[PDB]
Amino acid sequence: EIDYKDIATLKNYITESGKIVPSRITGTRAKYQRQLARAIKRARYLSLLPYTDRH
Amino acid sequence: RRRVIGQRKILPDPKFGSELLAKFVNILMVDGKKSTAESIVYSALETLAQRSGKSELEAFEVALENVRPTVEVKSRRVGGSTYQVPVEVRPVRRNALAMRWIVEAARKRGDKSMALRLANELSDAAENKGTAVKKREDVHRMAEANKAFA
Amino acid sequence: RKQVSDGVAHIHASFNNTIVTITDRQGNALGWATAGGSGFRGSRKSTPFAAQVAAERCADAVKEYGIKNLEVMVKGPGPGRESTIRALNAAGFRITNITDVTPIPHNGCRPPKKRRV
RNA sequence: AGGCGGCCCCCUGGACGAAGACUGACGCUCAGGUGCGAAAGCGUGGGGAGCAAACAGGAUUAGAUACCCUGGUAGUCCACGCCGUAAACGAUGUCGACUUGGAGGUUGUGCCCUUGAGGCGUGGCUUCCGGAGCUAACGCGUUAAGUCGACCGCCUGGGGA
RNA sequence: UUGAGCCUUGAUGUGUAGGAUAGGUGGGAGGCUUUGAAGUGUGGACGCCAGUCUGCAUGGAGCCGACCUUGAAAUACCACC
């Protein structure tokens, strides 16, 4: 919804395990986890974020 | 079930001494005559001390050090699965189990005299030379794999 | 034949076997051990009782390479996935890094739906 | 309806709000029609990781032709063309009005310098709990199986079929 | 770049008791090593834990014999296996 192309911001919401930080932990409303998942998908299909993890 | 009376604490003796020696003169009692074992207790050791150990002071220590059960084996099931399972034995009576395995064989074998039937048994016990122990070990060896469960 | 003293190690633990490898950063396998190597049948091979006795059998597989510092990679769900690592640390080796690399299901083909009982 | 989740670019049905207006009963239903399809199946040519009918083994067992384990073709996918059936199920035909709620979701929107985070309202869609009524009973319960009307589709015991 | 065969070359080699790992073996005082000996072990093989080789830490022309004493037999220099 806002500023989803900034990866220096987005990496505060995704884990070293290759997953997502829960909305319980960021203290955010349920639709922020949807806004975050949409930011992740919109950064993937823009060459801003990787699709997958592992070494 | 869970009760069951509390298991007993046995006794020492004012002449025979320790709780195990006080057990030796009371275990495998048949016909109740109660004067036979007091001529057989610590009386098979002087020849043991020149056959399978040393001194009348260590001849029975080493017998219950060579005969040393550390694991028991028993069936265990959980629904439609059954295993032979190994379990470590509790230490407090461990040497009294080993004692029983010697004094019974002097009764279950009937060869020459009672002045030989125990002394001949003890001289193999002080060396871990019991009957059929290779096939006994073959069960505990097979059950070892079942400490990894299913 | 001088010792290398530094390298990598790879741990795999499935629901049916634990398989441990001492590796090179080029992708070579220098020595290996399997939990079915202890003769155990079925999912026994995934327990610490099996995996904890594969570690020094794997250190024996590199006995002419010479090891000291190791970077570890771990995959798979099997319970043995860390006892095999502590047993290797207790063999006198020092872990430079630990990283988990267990896959997250992607496509996944077909699952049991339709699961055995 | 059956069904349908990605990001990105077109093409497009229907529904819905605010503040108004132009027609003038133009509405409601509907035999037979006229058009749809989930899985599987049929056709012509491709396709083949994973899953797997059939099949061949391992067995297991009294037997195993099956469960369970090892392999595995059809089928699953696509160009399309056919097929028209379902536990197509909240098992409740379509259409309209009247009428206790609570909790909650979802989408417009009227108003107070929104000086607005807040507060006061108000249409659309809809989930769970349930009250008057209905029902044999369970349930339906203002999205009613209620209260009442228009039309259509059906029906009179299993075993046989 | 290497499978296979073959030539070529080095390390060997001791016990026992004593300096001393004398492999065998035929000669034997001035002759030889510089791409080589020492250190003595870190660490690799073998091990009598000494030593030698792979290759260093590393240097870099020497050395060796007498006296002493082992043994069928000698320990520079040089063939042969």
UniProtKB/Swiss-Prot annotation, chain A:
GO MF annotation: an example: mRNA 5'-UTR binding
GO cellular component, one term: cytoplasm
Signal sequence bounds: none
Membrane-spanning intervals of the chain: none
Keywords: Acetylation, Ribonucleoprotein, Ribosomal protein, RNA-binding, rRNA-binding
GO biological process, any: cytoplasmic translation
Domain of life: Bacteria
Function as written in the Swiss-Prot or TrEMBL entry: Binds as a heterodimer with protein bS6 to the central domain of the 16S rRNA, where it helps stabilize the platform of the 30S subunit.
Oligomer and partners: Part of the 30S ribosomal subunit. Forms a tight heterodimer with protein bS6.
Protein family membership: Belongs to the bacterial ribosomal protein bS18 family.
Name assigned to this protein: Small ribosomal subunit protein bS18
Organism: Escherichia coli (strain K12)
Gene that this sequence comes from: rpsR
Residues of the full protein shown: 20 to 74 of 75
UniProtKB/Swiss-Prot annotation, chain B:
Keyword Ribosomal protein recorded: yes
UniProtKB keywords: Ribonucleoprotein, Ribosomal protein, RNA-binding, rRNA-binding, tRNA-binding
Recorded GO CC terms: cytoplasm; cytosol; cytosolic small ribosomal subunit; membrane; ribosome
GO biological processes: cytoplasmic translation; negative regulation of translation; ribosomal small subunit assembly; translation
Role noted for this protein: One of the primary rRNA binding proteins, it binds directly to 16S rRNA where it nucleates assembly of the head domain of the 30S subunit. Is located at the subunit interface close to the decoding center, where it has been shown to contact mRNA. Has been shown to contact tRNA in both the P and E sites; it probably blocks exit of the E site tRNA.
Subunit comment: Part of the 30S ribosomal subunit. Contacts proteins S9 and S11. Cross-links to IF3 and the P and E site tRNAs.
Protein name (Swiss-Prot/TrEMBL): Small ribosomal subunit protein uS7
Source organism of this protein record: Escherichia coli (strain K12)
From Swiss-Prot, chain C:
Protein name: Small ribosomal subunit protein uS11
Note: Has been predicted to contact the N-terminal domain of IF-3 based on footprint studies; exactly how IF-3 interacts with the 30S subunit is controversial.
GO MF annotation: an example: small ribosomal subunit rRNA binding
Purpose: Located on the platform of the 30S subunit, it bridges several disparate RNA helices of the 16S rRNA. Forms part of the Shine-Dalgarno cleft in the 70S ribosome.
GO-annotated cellular components: cytoplasm; cytosol; cytosolic small ribosomal subunit
Cross-referenced Gene3D superfamilies: Ribosomal protein S11 (3.30.420.80)
Family: Belongs to the universal ribosomal protein uS11 family.
Disulfide bonds: none
Keywords in alphabetical order: Methylation, Ribonucleoprotein, Ribosomal protein, RNA-binding, rRNA-binding
InterPro entries membership: Ribosomal_uS11 (IPR001971), Ribosomal_uS11_bac-type (IPR019981), Ribosomal_uS11_CS (IPR018102), Ribosomal_uS11_sf (IPR036967)
Provenance organism: Escherichia coli (strain K12)
NCBIfam families for the chain: PRK05309.1, uS11_bact
PROSITE patterns: RIBOSOMAL_S11 (PS00054)
Record GO biological process: cytoplasmic translation; translation
Subunit organization: Part of the 30S ribosomal subunit. Interacts with proteins uS7 and bS18. Cross-links to IF-3. In stalled ribosomes contacts ribosome rescue factor SmrB.
